[PDB]
């Protein structure tokens, strides 16, 4: 033999995990986030876009919409820690949103249902947005930091 045998071998039996105590409790969002509130997208494909908050989904994400007809952003998931919540709000009370859940977005081009869903939510939102002047223009403009902007100072 090139090398001797050990006198002892490890058991190849895997143990079982201890019974862990960590419950999943719900995530209460920061008070600045309420449906109808305009968000500034801080990152991702749509970064710098100004967008409307709609629903808090079960996976913790935020359901938002451009509206698509305004800035080009569709009904979409967005992560709450990547967004700046502004103080300007629209009333969301004529907007269904019940339909939309996590499974709705499971990955599995564009389904027609998605395309119709987008028209039905936005027409309600647009109805409400036209109410306050300049808001739609605001919603179609990209946010960006100019020279001398100091976020730790600025009110949004």
């Amino acid at each position: 033999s090139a090398q001797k045998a050990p006198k002892w071998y490890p058991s190849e039996d895997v143990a079982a995990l201890k019974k862990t105590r960590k419950a999943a409790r719900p995530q209460k969002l920061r008070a600045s986030l309420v449906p109808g509130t305009v968000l500034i997208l801080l990152a991702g494909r749509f970064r710098g876009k100004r967008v409307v908050y709609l629903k808090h989904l079960e996976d913790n994400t935020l359901l938002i919409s451009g509206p698509f007809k305004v800035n080009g952003v569709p009904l979409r998931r967005v992560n709450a820690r990547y967004v700046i919540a502004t103080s300007t709000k629209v009333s969301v009370e004529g907007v269904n949103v019940e339909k939309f859940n996590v499974e709705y977005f499971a990955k599995e081009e564009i389904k027609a249902e998605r395309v119709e869903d987008q028209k039905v939510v936005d027409k309600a939102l647009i109805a409400e947005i036209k109410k306050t002047p300049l808001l739609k223009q605001y919603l179609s403009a990209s946010f960006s930091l100019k020279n001398g902007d100091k976020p730790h100072m600025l009110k949004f």
């Binding site: 801080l42 820690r81 700046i84 919540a85 976020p151």
Partner: peptide, 8 residues
């Protein structure tokens, strides 16, 4: 320096 994670 970015603005995320955001607490605002």
């Amino acid at each position: 320096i970015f603005l995320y994670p955001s607490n605002i």
